[PDB]
Design a protein around this ligand. Structure first.
Ligand SMILES: *[C@H](C)[C@H]1/C(=C/c2[nH]c(/C=C3N=C(/C=C4\NC(=O)C(CC)=C4C)C(C)=C\3CCC(=O)O)c(CCC(=O)O)c2C)NC(=O)[C@@H]1C
Ligand SMILES: *[C@H](C)[C@H]1/C(=C/c2[nH]c(/C=C3N=C(/C=C4\NC(=O)C(CC)=C4C)C(C)=C\3CCC(=O)O)c(CCC(=O)O)c2C)NC(=O)[C@@H]1C
Ligand SMILES: *[C@H](C)[C@H]1/C(=C/c2[nH]c(/C=C3N=C(/C=C4\NC(=O)C(CC)=C4C)C(C)=C\3CCC(=O)O)c(CCC(=O)O)c2C)NC(=O)[C@@H]1C
Ligand SMILES: *[C@H](C)[C@H]1/C(=C/c2[nH]c(/C=C3N=C(/C=C4\NC(=O)C(CC)=C4C)C(C)=C\3CCC(=O)O)c(CCC(=O)O)c2C)NC(=O)[C@@H]1C
Ligand SMILES: CCC1=C(C)/C(=C/C2=NC(=C\c3[nH]c(/C=C4\NC(=O)[C@H](C)[C@H]4CC)c(C)c3CCC(=O)O)/C(CCC(=O)O)=C2C)NC1=O
Ligand SMILES: CCC1=C(C)/C(=C/C2=NC(=C\c3[nH]c(/C=C4\NC(=O)[C@H](C)[C@H]4CC)c(C)c3CCC(=O)O)/C(CCC(=O)O)=C2C)NC1=O
Ligand SMILES: CCC1=C(C)/C(=C/C2=NC(=C\c3[nH]c(/C=C4\NC(=O)[C@H](C)[C@H]4CC)c(C)c3CCC(=O)O)/C(CCC(=O)O)=C2C)NC1=O
Ligand SMILES: CCC1=C(C)/C(=C/C2=NC(=C\c3[nH]c(/C=C4\NC(=O)[C@H](C)[C@H]4CC)c(C)c3CCC(=O)O)/C(CCC(=O)O)=C2C)NC1=O
Ligand SMILES: CCC1=C(C)/C(=C/C2=NC(=C\c3[nH]c(/C=C4\NC(=O)[C@H](C)[C@H]4CC)c(C)c3CCC(=O)O)/C(CCC(=O)O)=C2C)NC1=O
Ligand SMILES: CCC1=C(C)/C(=C/C2=NC(=C\c3[nH]c(/C=C4\NC(=O)[C@H](C)[C@H]4CC)c(C)c3CCC(=O)O)/C(CCC(=O)O)=C2C)NC1=O
Lengths: 161, 46, 48, 48, 97, 169, 160, 66, 161, 161, 161, 160, 160
């Protein structure tokens, strides 16, 4: 796990020097927005089962992915996918406080291009589900925090590609 | 007597004795070519 | 040729050709095929 | 048919159990050097 | 612990699948499709690698970069055409100085 | 694992349909042979520990390269391992004989078997002859018990042949 | 076989099978009893066919059994007597399938390079195929020697 | 290096085109000696009329040196 | 590609033996059914375009898919779909006369789990268009062949899902 | 396809320093054995088809892979197995002139171990053919020259394992 | 993991013959050089940590590898590089007493190239590291056994490159 | 940091973040302006710290100056202060992160071999950070020496 | 012992003792009379050997003799002179046991943690038993000096 703090420190450590003015210049922008993100995480986890409920109902319900032969048909797989999509809501809130998309590379995005072709589950419906989950969480957390929330949603969607 | 350790060290090697040399050699079949072999043995009289 | 390889027998016909003749006839045998000449032409830059 | 493959890395299990393979493989799994009683096998075995 | 992509679930699911779309000689023989460079998934750097038993003659199914109906598997008499506005720009030499 | 009944379930489940007239007559075709399936499966396991012993002595008397020091059936470390590795092909042929299709054979024995034997140096060649000496025979103890034999009681054995052995033609 | 040769010709033109092509399969399936009856005469009397054509090759080419030869001695002749078992097995696979692709994938493609590496003269073993055509026609019928013998004249031109 | 000079005339033979398509019809490419039998077998399948063939460089009937 | 004639040959060749009496008996079981397969091919290829037209009107037309938003909107994505159902019909009839679905393992079902995901094609509509295609080609060919046609349709239908 | 001489150059490139005493101590050892390397690589090229016909005679001929069922049965592969056996002799001769086994990893040992699993050819049967090829070269170029030939033969079967 | 005892007997097992007089001539040198092998093994175990201390002081310290950016900068990686450098002294002494290099083929060269290309370890700094302790052990155990120990280091260094 | 130790303790139960534990992130940010003012003041006299605290080390440990011990001349004592400059870099890395886990993953986790295999003892380096501790309090205020001194004794605890 | 280490590996693979492995015991029961001829020499010459090798040790490390060092005074020599007397008892116990294992059960497995709390520079007692190695090998024959030196060299690598 890497922080926005450790993305300053280790980027100043592999050069082998101390903290310059530009190293603290990334910290002071993180400390001026640290108070906004801690309010942002506790209102997403308040409604974490309510974020998933609309975003499933927006992207793919009453479609032909839940009618039979579609990949989210059986109740193993419908209970799989909401359990699958609960990670992408949670591991973005893990990275919104961290200020760093490299949370997702160690935990989510590494083996995620595989095990989606390997089960034949649709990538294009999942990215359609994340991108509408961005537009339901903008209405709860506010407009400004959703910009910092929408970066890590697009980081999911780019590396899943 | 009753030596704790044994053997004469000797002058050298054990370094490059690794590569074996042999005429394998080749593969005259001998088994399931017996039917074929009998025909060939039979053919020799001509 | 602007496409991937088609399968296995289309690639086994190229792998023995660079095993015997070399690389200079591998790049020849792509170009004087029917799929290069009749899909691109003799005066076009190839494209994917 | 078969639709996938895990891999086919050669695996070889010994047909035998002689002394310099078993004394080493009983000393490899303990993750240590060859101790002073383990050298006493090979100093006896090679002398015999 | 350096096999980062998972082993079993990529082939426990693959046994129920048909033959997955890759190169015929394994996934490590399949370059990333960018403008230049010929980068490859090097199988020794990070173990992507996953063989698949491919047949004696197989056809990888490919997508026509351009018009959808203008794949050559439907109409072989349409592969000499220009791809039009959907595909990339075709160049040709007309005016010689 | 996956019966001929349950293969017809997800042949019909994924399209979201009920059981029509074709479902009611293909499934009755399985049930009219079910008395002939089970009684053939009893007499296959009548002398199944003998049936591998009569086959492999008829194998190794037919291919004597695999006894003399060549390919791996040389010691009793190999030979008693060979009789066990033969015995899985007899035992799993009993299951798919009862189960209707070969999907028990598809994901218990066939998957990885091209890759297990290549990692050991076990040839795939006489293994096909080893199933070829059983599938014709297995039919002897079905014939000497009085059960008819033909459509099935090979449905399983040559699915262990046509999918294990590599395609030449 | 007949149909899987005509399927892969009908795939490159990207079209269904012609009614001028489908009657070929219709004639072949109905004439399936006769070609199997050709094939049992090959299998049921093949110890006569190899032993006579083996004698005919070593009289037409006596350089093979000479010292310094490939098939010299008791052992090395026995696989040349067993290689003709293999080519006769491909003809009796061929007449049942009715086409050339069970012969073409097994014994035709790599055969220029195979006997090149083994040291045998390639046309000499290909000459014994031509002698094996003559004995397999002698035990065959009037029309059946012409139809089943056509794949024999494929194989001599396969190696040469 | 034995470079041939060939003057072909290749008709359209189907698939009429509103383009230039003059360079594809009547061209005067020069080809090396090794890459011409694959070229000349290609130019017959389009129904092309090979008009003029002249060995531009290279000695006729030489034995060594390309 | 394995014909049912060549599958008995490929079985009997790798054992090394010649044609057995049981292996000859399997080809006579194929040759007795050879009239029924070659009847089914010529009654399809006369009107293979008509089966495509009757299958899209049963299941796909006037739906969400052919409307805006769906995937059979914007006729680039409709002429591609009509030839796509032409592909499964043309490759079922090759698998009919082969008597063995080995064509579909080689030339059909390779990428179709991933290429429909990587093109945004809903699999839950093309797996019903296949079953709607089977229900019209059973009425067009006959009740006897339509079970045996329906084996190689459901091999494609299970391969897509 | 860098050799052993450019390997010392590239090891002295990243360090940035010039050629010291220990940097050239591994360089004169090439020039001492270089006359043995240039002479022995001609004789392997002189007998580049008698070696391959002996190495498959020593292990592969008359074995069970040449029986029906095995990979060495159909002429079509047999000849692939010979052509694949022809590369390992030639690239060992390219490696011995270079003095560097990184000839083979960049060229032949990169994707070989998984291509052989995608065909299903036995890896553990190939190793005895290259081990027998290491024997027949050592009887050909003498005892000392087969040692450095046998290093790069053992590099291929270790990379294949 | 097969030794010189196994490699001789399995050379006579698949031949089917007894112990022929060339192999006892190999076996006589394996048994008479045991007190050279014991004296070499008891002294490398006498100072196992002195040798690897002088090995990294020969070629690794004060390079760019120890300077930040390099792959020995943290004290995690200096303990890692010195554990792995001990492992090529343990397994070299294991293959010393068995007389065959097949222990290193099974145990240490199985996934060595997989590890060091996954952490970005410089391989070209390691092939001089094991070459550095080739001098140190041969100065410690003598010129006789250091010639014997130099083969298994060079077998590791051939597999390393 | 706090935040990368917050999240890695939330993955170990696979829950969301505890709301009382979310206040220790909110206390981490608002108490961050005075923490980085400590770090630049140690950086602003990092040579003045080291060239002073190195001198009181050698009067306490005369083995590393009188010949016979480990590090000597210009050739190793400059490398001896190259170690102490790395540890001073780690503490000002640890102050801006709030915790000792940048010092944990970088600089203490393998210390008991890399001097143990390198001949030098451990405890004089533990007397060196104590020499660095006394000059770090004297540059700062009262309470700032309490917080920054809490990272120095962690270096003593992992080494000795 | 030689018995016990050869038991607990053969027990751990759940077999008997294999008869290739019994001969490490069959050898050493003949040479048990050798080791009791060795152990009687070192114990009687111990109170000779303790009063010069400690004085040999103090030349190369004299700051521990100096005030500030941990051996200052005659009462602060019995902490060090008996410790080398403690260690040669474990050497002679390693002689009679055949292998090195009574030192592992007694004298090695806390020396890093012991002398850290005792304040002793631990690199001196490795040099102190290095002084023990050089003079004890002189008192015996060279066959004994090679065997008894190998137990010393584990105790060299104990504190190093
Ligand atoms: C009978 C008086 C003699 C005899 C005859 C015999 N043996 C077999 C079969 C086998 N013999 C072996 C032998 C061994 N396996 C080992 O591991 C070892 C130690 C190295 C030995 C000696 C094996 C594996 C078989 C089975 C495979 C085979 O068919 O050879 C037969 C054939 C039995 C049959 O027809 O099924 C016969 C007649 N064996 C003796 O011990 C007597 C000398
Ligand atoms: C004997 C007639 C043939 C033969 C057999 C042979 N097999 C092995 C080893 C194994 N066989 C298997 C096979 C399976 N394991 C399974 O779980 C299943 C599905 C139920 C199958 C088909 C495996 C895993 C092994 C490895 C050992 C093990 O079981 O763990 C050997 C041993 C090889 C050796 O020499 O050690 C032998 C001899 N070989 C032949 O030649 C005959 C064709
Ligand atoms: C040290 C001389 C060189 C070096 C070492 C280094 N290694 C790692 C990480 C690992 N090293 C190994 C080594 C081996 N594993 C084996 O199984 C064997 C054979 C028995 C050996 C020799 C392994 C598995 C790892 C992974 C970690 C682990 O052991 O659990 C590191 C750390 C890399 C990192 O990024 O953390 C280092 C520094 N690297 C060098 O630069 C030296 C040349
Ligand atoms: C000085 C106060 C103490 C001391 C230092 C000393 N060190 C060495 C050699 C090295 N020291 C290090 C130190 C570190 N390496 C790290 O990676 C980190 C964390 C970032 C630290 C603190 C290293 C790697 C070495 C090896 C050489 C190098 O840096 O390249 C010496 C020289 C030893 C020699 O024999 O040459 C000395 C003198 N030793 C003491 O006595 C002081 C107590
Ligand atoms: C079904 C496809 C198929 C082919 C084509 C095939 C050829 C084949 N011929 C072989 C040998 C041989 N084949 C011959 C045959 C001949 N030499 C002559 O002089 C005659 C002119 C000629 C035949 C009449 C000889 C002499 C050898 C032995 C070569 C040697 O061992 O050096 C061998 C090696 C031993 C063996 O396994 O039999 C193969 C693999 N095997 C196959 O499975
Ligand atoms: C842009 C400059 C340019 C021109 C002008 C041009 C002409 C051109 N006219 C052609 C044919 C033709 N031109 C004609 C001409 C006519 N019908 C008649 O018979 C009359 C005599 C004449 C009335 C207008 C015919 C019939 C052909 C086809 C000849 C054939 O294929 O048999 C062809 C060969 C087939 C083709 O590629 O179209 C070219 C290349 N190409 C060029 O690049
Ligand atoms: C935006 C590009 C676009 C077009 C043009 C389009 C056309 C389109 N026209 C359709 C049907 C139709 N279109 C017509 C239209 C006509 N029939 C006639 O006879 C007249 C000639 C003609 C217009 C004057 C009719 C009658 C049908 C339904 C077919 C039927 O009832 O059998 C359908 C199938 C059902 C539907 O979704 O409406 C499509 C998809 N779709 C598209 O995405
Ligand atoms: C049998 C072997 C085979 C398959 C599987 C196949 C699929 C296939 N479908 C494609 C496009 C398409 N295929 C469809 C088809 C559908 N989407 C829907 O909504 C419907 C459910 C369904 C058909 C009725 C559509 C809409 C596209 C256009 C997607 C695009 O171009 O972005 C393309 C890319 C364009 C092309 O090259 O044709 C391929 C390769 N082609 C083949 O040769
Ligand atoms: C440049 C590096 C390189 C090598 C070496 C290589 C080998 C290679 N061997 C192949 C097949 C094959 N390779 C072999 C070879 C063998 N099987 C055996 O049993 C023997 C042990 C061994 C011969 C000595 C055989 C028999 C086939 C055919 C497999 C089949 O058709 O099922 C194939 C797929 C077919 C083709 O060539 O088009 C490749 C790509 N490819 C490479 O790119
Ligand atoms: C064999 C198992 C064993 C160990 C490990 C052991 C350690 C040991 N070391 C001690 C003292 C000591 N040992 C030393 C050690 C030394 N003096 C020096 O100057 C040298 C550097 C070094 C030895 C050559 C010192 C300095 C003390 C006193 C520590 C103090 O007073 O703070 C004491 C307390 C007094 C005593 O009973 O001797 C014990 C128990 N005793 C044992 O029986």
């Amino acid at each position: 796990m890497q922080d926005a703090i450790t993305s300053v420190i280790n980027s100043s450590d592999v050069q082998g020097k101390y903290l310059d003015a530009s190293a603290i210049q990334k910290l002071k922008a993180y400390f001026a927005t640290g108070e906004l993100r801690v309010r942002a995480a506790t209102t997403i986890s308040a409604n974490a089962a309510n974020i998933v409920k609309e975003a499933v109902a927006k992207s793919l319900l009453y479609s032909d992915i839940t009618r039979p032969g579609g990949n989210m048909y059986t109740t193993r797989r419908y209970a799989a996918c909401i359990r699958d999509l609960d990670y992408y809501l949670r591991y973005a809130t893990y990275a919104m406080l961290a200020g760093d998309p490299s949370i997702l590379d160690e935990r989510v995005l590494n083996g995620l291009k595989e095990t989606y072709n390997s089960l034949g589950v649709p990538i294009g419906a999942t990215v359609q589900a994340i991108q509408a989950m961005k537009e339901v969480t903008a209405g709860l957390v506010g407009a400004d925090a959703g910009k910092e929330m929408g970066i890590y949603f697009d980081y999911i969607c780019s590396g899943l590609s | 007597n009753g030596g704790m350790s044994k053997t004469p060290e000797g002058m050298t090697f054990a370094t490059d004795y690794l590569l074996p040399k042999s005429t394998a050699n080749r593969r005259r079949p001998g088994p399931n070519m017996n039917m074929f072999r009998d025909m060939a043995r039979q053919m020799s009289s001509k | 040729l602007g496409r991937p390889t088609y399968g296995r027998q289309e690639m086994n016909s190229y792998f023995d050709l660079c095993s015997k003749k070399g690389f200079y006839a591998l790049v020849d045998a792509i170009i004087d095929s029917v799929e290069y000449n009749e899909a691109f032409g003799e005066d076009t830059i190839p494209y994917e | 048919s078969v639709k996938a493959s895990g891999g086919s890395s050669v695996a070889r299990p010994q047909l035998y159990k002689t002394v310099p393979v078993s004394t080493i493989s009983q000393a490899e799994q303990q993750d240590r050097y060859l101790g002073k009683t383990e050298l006493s096998d090979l100093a006896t075995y090679f002398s015999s | 612990p350096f096999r980062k992509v998972p082993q079993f679930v990529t082939l426990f699911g693959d046994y129920k699948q048909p033959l997955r779309d890759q190169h015929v000689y394994g996934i490590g023989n399949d370059p990333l499709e960018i403008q230049f460079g010929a980068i490859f998934p090097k199988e020794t750097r990070s173990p992507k690698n996953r063989p698949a038993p491919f047949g004696k003659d197989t056809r990888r199914i490919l997508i026509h970069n351009g018009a959808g109906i203008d794949n050559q598997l439907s109409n072989p008499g349409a592969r000499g055409n220009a791809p039009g506005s959907l595909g990339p720009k075709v160049f040709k030499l007309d005016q010689l100085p | 694992m996956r019966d001929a009944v349950t293969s017809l379930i997800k042949n019909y489940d994924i399209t979201g349909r009920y059981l029509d007239r074709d479902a009611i007559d293909s499934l009755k075709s399985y049930f009219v042979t079910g008395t002939a399936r089970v009684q053939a499966a009893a007499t296959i396991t009548a002398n199944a520990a003998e049936l591998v012993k009569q086959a492999a002595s008829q194998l190794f008397g037919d291919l004597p390269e695999l006894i003399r020091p060549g390919g791996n059936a040389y010691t009793t470390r190999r030979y008693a391992a060979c009789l066990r590795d033969m015995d899985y092909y007899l035992r799993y042929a009993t299951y798919a004989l009862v189960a209707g299709d070969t999907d028990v054979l598809d994901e218990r024995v066939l998957q990885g078997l091209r890759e297990t034997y290549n990692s050991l140096g076990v040839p795939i060649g006489p293994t096909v002859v080893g199933i070829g000496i059983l599938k014709d025979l297995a039919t002897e103890k079905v014939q000497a018990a009085g059960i008819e034999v033909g459509a099935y009681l090979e449905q399983p054995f040559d699915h262990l042949i046509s999918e294990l052995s590599e395609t030449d033609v | 076989s007949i149909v899987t040769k005509s399927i892969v010709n009908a795939d490159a033109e990207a079209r269904y099978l012609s009614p001028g092509e489908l009657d070929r399969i219709k004639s072949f399936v109905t004439s399936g009893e006769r070609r199997v009856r050709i094939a049992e005469t090959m299998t049921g009397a093949r110890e006569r066919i190899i032993k006579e054509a083996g004698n005919q090759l070593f009289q037409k080419r006596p350089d093979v059994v000479s010292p310094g030869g490939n098939a010299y001695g008791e052992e090395m002749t026995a696989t040349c007597l067993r290689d003709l078992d293999y080519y006769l097995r491909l003809i009796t696979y061929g007449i049942v399938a009715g086409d050339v692709t069970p012969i073409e994938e097994i014994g035709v493609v790599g055969v220029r390079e195979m006997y090149k590496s083994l040291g045998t003269p390639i046309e000499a073993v290909a000459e014994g195929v031509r002698a094996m055509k003559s004995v397999a026609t002698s035990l065959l019928s009037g029309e059946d020697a012409a139809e089943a013998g056509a794949y024999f004249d494929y194989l001599i031109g396969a190696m040469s | 290096m034995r470079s041939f000079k060939v003057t072909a005339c290749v008709p359209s033979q189907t698939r009429i085109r509103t383009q230039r398509e003059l360079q594809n019809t009547y061209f005067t490419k020069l080809v090396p000696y090794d890459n011409w039998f694959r070229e000349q077998q290609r130019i017959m399948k389009m129904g092309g009329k090979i008009v003029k063939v002249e060995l531009a460089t290279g000695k006729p009937g030489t034995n060594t040196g390309l």
